[PDB]
Amino acid sequence: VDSLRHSRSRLNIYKALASPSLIALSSEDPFLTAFQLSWELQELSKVENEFKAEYEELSHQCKHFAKDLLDQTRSSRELELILNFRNELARLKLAIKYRQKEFVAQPNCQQLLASRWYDEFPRHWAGKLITCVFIGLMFPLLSLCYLVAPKSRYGLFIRKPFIKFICHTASYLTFLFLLLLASQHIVNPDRQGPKPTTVEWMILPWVLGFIWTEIKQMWDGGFQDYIHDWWNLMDFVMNSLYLATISLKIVAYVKYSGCKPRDTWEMWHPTLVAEAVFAIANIFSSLRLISLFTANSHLGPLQISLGRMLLDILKFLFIYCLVLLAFANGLNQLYFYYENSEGMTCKGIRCERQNNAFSTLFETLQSLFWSIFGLISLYVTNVKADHKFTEFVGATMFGTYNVISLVVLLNMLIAMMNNSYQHIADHADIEWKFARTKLWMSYFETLPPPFNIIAENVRLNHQYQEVLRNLVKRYVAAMIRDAKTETEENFKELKQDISSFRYEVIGMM
Amino acid sequence: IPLRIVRAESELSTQEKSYLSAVEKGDYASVKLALEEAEIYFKININCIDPLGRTALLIAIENENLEIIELLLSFNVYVGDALLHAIRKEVVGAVELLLNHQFSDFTPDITPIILAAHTNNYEIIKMLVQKGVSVPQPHVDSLRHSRSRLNIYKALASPSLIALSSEDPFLTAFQLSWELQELSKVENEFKAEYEELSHQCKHFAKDLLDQTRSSRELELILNFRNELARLKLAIKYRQKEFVAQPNCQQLLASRWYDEFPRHWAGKLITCVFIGLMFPLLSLCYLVAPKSRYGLFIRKPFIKFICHTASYLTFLFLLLLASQHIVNPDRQGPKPTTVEWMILPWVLGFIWTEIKQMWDGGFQDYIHDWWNLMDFVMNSLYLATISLKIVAYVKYSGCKPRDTWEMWHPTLVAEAVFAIANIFSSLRLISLFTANSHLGPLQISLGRMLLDILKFLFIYCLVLLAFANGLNQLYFYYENSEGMTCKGIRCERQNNAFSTLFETLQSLFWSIFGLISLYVTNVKADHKFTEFVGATMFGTYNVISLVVLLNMLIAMMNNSYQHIADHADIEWKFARTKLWMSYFETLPPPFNIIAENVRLNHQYQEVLRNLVKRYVAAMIRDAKTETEENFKELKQDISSFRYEVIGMM
Amino acid sequence: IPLRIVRAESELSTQEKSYLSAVEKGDYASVKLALEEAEIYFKININCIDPLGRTALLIAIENENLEIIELLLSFN
Ligand SMILES: CC(C)CCC[C@@H](C)[C@H]1CC[C@H]2[C@@H]3CC=C4C[C@@H](OC(=O)CCC(=O)O)CC[C@]4(C)[C@H]3CC[C@]12C
Ligand SMILES: CC(C)CCC[C@@H](C)[C@H]1CC[C@H]2[C@@H]3CC=C4C[C@@H](OC(=O)CCC(=O)O)CC[C@]4(C)[C@H]3CC[C@]12C
Ligand SMILES: CCCCCC(=O)OC[C@H](COP(=O)(O)O)OC(=O)CCCCC
Ligand SMILES: CCCCCC(=O)OC[C@H](COP(=O)(O)O)OC(=O)CCCCC
């Protein structure tokens, strides 16, 4: 009825319900109420379209409160009772689920996670490097002795999370190494009908391991907050291109045994499309080695900045694309009557001599894409005529595009990326430690082999209620003796010095 | 609609609220009248806490009222950890009484001197050490161990504790800043905390030195255990705020010049006038190392000019070492006049590097980047000498150079000589910590290289990814029939993406606009594979040119925004250690052919004066600021109190 | 575990602390009554400094109280 009073009414009761004092005095588990309430305020930041600063600030204060309760633990036993609460680390898994990144970048949580993660890694760079590569040279030994005996002989190494991280990393980069090896002239000549190499038969029990791994993590995620991860999309396009490569090599393996020379083949021959899809596949498979950068202390926040400024490069690639289509609409309309292709053994704009560039809309788009790299060499604007007015207008509206692209939109791109990175370094290490946390959580269960894939609660609820009572009492103390203080600290001493002297005067009579 | 209940928490009776209201509002009459229920049981414990978690003693400490505290201690109220509550409020009148007599508000691993040092109050620590309170030494619960070590390091790193104890505060500040810098990296996660503590130790070591009011005192500080031994130890411990102190820089500059004094014309002409006469000065130093003329070379600025002039005339007759005025093309060099002039500079660098590597014991030697640059420079020079020796024997054919082999020793010698003198000409960049204008800019150079060296870990795997794509797409297209010229360095761009090496080379050169887009064609009609090759080459050009380069400039931008708070400090530290490199004894640039009890006494006296001055500048400043007007308010209230009560 | 000792520094007696407490808290009665020990030697110099490095005149300047300053200058 009154869309004003409804909105401010909901805003008032959410801001009242999101105070730390009300969550302290009520709401039996303050962690769940802080978590769910930060989630609901994050939802209403987007659903209610306009008070997003207000709802965003309330959700941020809920996150800070959930952190500051955890910050008051003074025993590691207490911290274990907080995080291992409903296998293990169930509250920490729920905290990862609710995007509580200030909660999980708390330092003592990171000590408990690092003590889980290492299990005797300890030094300096030489010893750490040589021990990591010494483990990495022995990953199939460790994996096959885990398979022949999953017991306390040696498989405790693969049960340790750092060592299985090294083993998965070594297996993935040796997959990349024998993809690097998968094109050398040492190893087939050019015939229709592949009959795949030794190297492809070595490739296949890695790709099938990725198929099984993706099917497992997609099945046990129920496609929700699965596809919402970008790396699952990258795995999906990678494995789809791999399955298309396998299927197209199966199609080309039958029906084709002519051994006719490759220069005499057709366009859209299945072998050529298979090799192209294989290249588009292994660019992605070699590229998502970038996602191991949430493990190094030095490379972490920089690739976080990468992944966040892509979200503004993806806005300039909505402005720039319609600038592109505008100048394409201009240029092909100006030059499509100039279709010079008599002779011309070589056509297009990938040619050694720049032929008719702006003839079709496709070559026009292609030309204007390549002109921002200094690769369209300015004699494309001539035509074999004496039409110097149309040639001059073509050069003029090509120079206009070069200006708008090169000295305006590129510099706006660097200005937007500049301040958009100035916005983030207040919450840089928090997001990095959250990312390396969930990467560490991805190695605690149970999937050991990288490519070789062939009452009991009443005590705990009691201890959890006791630890919550102590944490709430400590937090109420750290709120009263700090925020009430600061300046009111000297003002209360003034009030004392006035009132005590008042009772000294009146009581004297 | 949530009908909720308050969480379980202990609640106060109303008969103790009438007591606590008089405690907070501050009576002495009615509080003592409530405290007349010691023998007569008024069914209450007087120390039972309120819903705020306070005993009444904690209020009386919280309201600074000494007489209620005296009353409650006179009637034996339970303190628990009231001492720590008094120390945390830094009320002196409470602590001076409490020293003279389940729940905690503190971690139980806190002794009463630790939080006293955390609060950084002088007289509280001063009366605690009169009681003789010892702090532990920092050699199951990985939480309590870490916070325990952090508390005792933060307590040990307070300026007041280093003032009142620890006989030489300079050494304790230095070693403690070193240990906190180590634990910044070893303890992986409290690096802001340990880093801030080490920074405050550095500021304290500076502010002790800042209080010297006599140059004699400053000399007694720096020349203490040849000379400048404490300054050398300060350079050793990376105390860059300590050495960018101004008066230390005046003493260093008075050492450095020794009558340089003007304006740019006179300074320029006198510097180049000295620089035109460096072999005269060096050989008259060698024939007579006495007070004739060699006092010039003993002066540090003049020997800096002489080493600079010798190094740039080495570079000048390397510039001269390729002109057509001076050999034709034969196997067997028999080196030039110019190479025979080069050799007694290179051997001087060999002797200089061996000396400074021998007397550094390879530790904090190789940790300097310029020693690595000297090492690769002299290694390439020795390889050049050895390869010219190898080519000088066994080769006298005088066959034309176009008919030579690849990997011939003369050609590899000349290539290694070029890779050598690019470095030898390049480390003239390291004389830029002597000019006032060029200094901080090359400091910014040397620090933003540490993020360019992170983009050259991202960019290299982007490179290897697109190389894996492109050579896999094009290795069946090996067109080399005919082709007198091959590769991608050719005049016509031949088969670019054939091997992985030429692929990497192509994708490196494509970011400079030098790969001219007809490399993606092959002599076929395979327009799909040609289009996918152009598409995944354009993807690389986009990711390289408009994404990673702009991320590189954004990271370098804010990474330089982080540094200009400590720019001149690091520059003066760098030019300091460059000046320290010219005070001993290595004069020739290329022409290389009890007594402590008095000093310890004076040093203890100067330290006593400096500590006393610093305690004064801490008390009269940091205690002041606003508490400065508040203390005047306290005076105006208490003086009028004694005017009223004393009137009766 | 470091068993350390305070650095050498001059220490105040307890008989001048009762004087200085009245100086900081700001009496005129008891400060003058302590300053009645000019002719009668109470074995103390009234200008002897505390561990804070202050004579009582410096406190009376520090607490803006003109009459204690006038008293101490009147008693030299
Ligand atoms: C040939 C070069 C130019 C490109 C090939 C890339 C690889 C050499 C790089 C890419 C990613 C790098 C990885 C990035 C991150 C880490 C994490 C690192 O783990 C840590 O540093 C954790 C230390 C800690 O516990 O704090 C181990 C090395 C590793 C796997 C690196 C190993 C080397 C890798 C595979
Ligand atoms: C031909 C040009 C374009 C390139 C050749 C480079 C040289 C001309 C430059 C490179 C480094 C320069 C040196 C950089 C730093 C200094 C420090 C400068 O000393 C001071 O200014 C100190 C003044 C002070 O005491 O504050 C004396 C000139 C000098 C040696 C410069 C002399 C001229 C040098 C050798
Ligand atoms: C956002 C503003 C866009 C400006 C577009 C533009 O300047 O076009 C340049 C035009 C295009 O160059 P040509 O067509 O080759 O002459 O240059 C000139 O005509 C004369 C030189 C004049 C050079 C300025
Ligand atoms: C980070 C995003 C990477 C985008 C990669 C990319 O845009 O490739 C451009 C491709 C590559 O250019 P060509 O292969 O020469 O056509 O251009 C086109 O196919 C049509 C013009 C379309 C121009 C946009």
Numbering used by the authors:
A (entry chain A): 187 to 272, 284 to 319, 324 to 388, 391 to 648, 652 to 660, 696 to 727, 731 to 753
B (entry chain B): 18 to 118, 135 to 172, 187 to 272, 284 to 319, 324 to 388, 391 to 648, 652 to 660, 696 to 727, ...
C (entry chain D): 18 to 93
Question: What are the paper's exact sentences on this?
Answer:
The resulting sample was homogeneous and suitable for structural studies. We then solved the structure of TRPC4DR in its unliganded (apo), closed state by cryo-EM and single-particle analysis at an average resolution of 3.6 Å. The final model contains residues 18–753 with some loops missing. It sits inside the membrane and forms a cavity with helices S1 and S4 in which we could identify density corresponding to a sterol. Since we added CHS during the purification of TRPC4DR, we fitted this molecule into the density. The selectivity filter is formed by four glycine residues (G577) that constrict the pore to a diameter of 7.0 Å (3.7 Å defined by opposing van der Waals surfaces). The lumen of the pore below the selectivity filter is mainly hydrophobic and leads to the lower gate at the cytoplasmic end formed by the conserved residues I617 and N621. The four isoleucines and four asparagines constrict the pore to a diameter of ~5.3 and ~4.2 Å, respectively (1.6 and 0.7 Å defined by opposing van der Waals surfaces). In our TrpC4DR structure F572 and W573 form part of a prominent hydrophobic contact between the pore helix of one protomer and helix S6 of the adjacent protomer, stabilizing the pore. Interestingly, we found an additional density corresponding to an annular lipid at this interface. Since PA has been assigned to a similar density found in polycytin-2 and PA has been included in our purification buffer we fitted PA into the density.
TRPC4 is one of seven members of the subfamily of TRPC (canonical TRPs) channels. TRPC channels are Ca2+/Na+-permeable cation channels that are expressed in many cell types and tissues, including brain, placenta, adrenal gland, retina endothelia, testis, and kidney. The channels play an important role in vasorelaxation and neurotransmitter release. Several studies showed that TRPC4 and TRPC5 form receptor-operated, Ca2+-permeable, non-selective cation channels.
